[PDB]
Amino acid sequence: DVDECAMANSNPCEHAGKCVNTDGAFHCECLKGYAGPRCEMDINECHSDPCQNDATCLDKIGGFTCLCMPGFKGVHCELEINECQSNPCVNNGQCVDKVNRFQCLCPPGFTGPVCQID
Ligand SMILES: *[C@@H]1O[C@H](CO)[C@@H](O)[C@H](O[C@@H]2OC[C@@H](O)[C@H](O)[C@H]2O)[C@H]1O
Ligand SMILES: *[C@@H]1O[C@H](CO)[C@@H](O)[C@H](O)[C@H]1O
Ligand SMILES: *[C@@H]1O[C@@H](C)[C@@H](O)[C@@H](O)[C@@H]1O
Ligand SMILES: [Ca+2]
Ligand SMILES: [Ca+2]
Ligand SMILES: [Ca+2]
């Protein structure tokens, strides 16, 4: 048998996989996110569709990241930002939290996006 893990100048496994010599061939212990007989395959962690609310899943090494639609947040984009948190309405306007925006319900006699015009 040839020791592919010892006689090699560089790792015969891909992606820093750990070479384990066997009789007639060799084995590769793959790090997280890699698969295949030589760890050559990058696992697509986005195949399970983890991102919610029409977010876009980007495949990463041993994981993923979600690009949220505007107005959403969280690991899976499962939360909605509350644009009313900053108290945008003035003149005692009531703030309604929408997706990626707020709406100020103004008391009669006031207009404007945040009820700033008497
Ligand atoms: C397939 O969908 C799952 C829904 O939650 C998701 O967990 C899976 O994600 C992975 O799990 C969480 C993250 O921390 C890991 O890095 C990732 O492998 C997804 O693949
Ligand atoms: C927080 O308040 C500001 C105005 O002060 C507004 O621009 C933001 O949209 C709101 O979320
Ligand atoms: C991925 O990103 C999200 C935010 C949406 O714009 C999708 O349409 C896109 O494919
Ligand atoms: Ca061998
Ligand atoms: Ca991946
Ligand atoms: Ca919102």
Residue numbers in the entry: 415 to 532
What's the publication's text?
The Notch signalling pathway is conserved across all metazoan species and plays key roles in many aspects of cell biology including cell‐fate determination, stem cell maintenance, immune system activation and angiogenesis in humans (Guruharsha et al, 2012; Bray, 2016). Aberrant Notch signalling results in a number of inherited and acquired disorders, including various cancers, and it is therefore a key target for therapeutic intervention (Hansson et al, 2004; Groth & Fortini, 2012). Both the Notch receptors and the ligands are single‐pass type I transmembrane proteins, and direct protein–protein contact between adjacent cells initiates an intracellular signalling pathway. Binding of a Notch ligand to EGF11‐12 of a Notch receptor results in a series of proteolytic cleavages, with the final intra‐membrane cleavage by gamma secretase, causing the release of the intracellular domain of Notch (NICD) from the plasma membrane.
Human Notch2 EGF11‐13 has 67% sequence identity with human Notch1, and superposition of the two structures shows that both adopt a very similar linear arrangement (RMSD = 1.55 Å). In contrast, the O‐glucose modifications affecting specific serine residues in Notch2 appear to stabilize intramolecular structure as observed previously for the Notch1 complex (Luca et al, 2015): the disaccharide (glucose + xylose) on Ser‐462 may stabilize Notch2 EGF12 through interaction with Phe‐478 (shown), shielding it from the solvent.
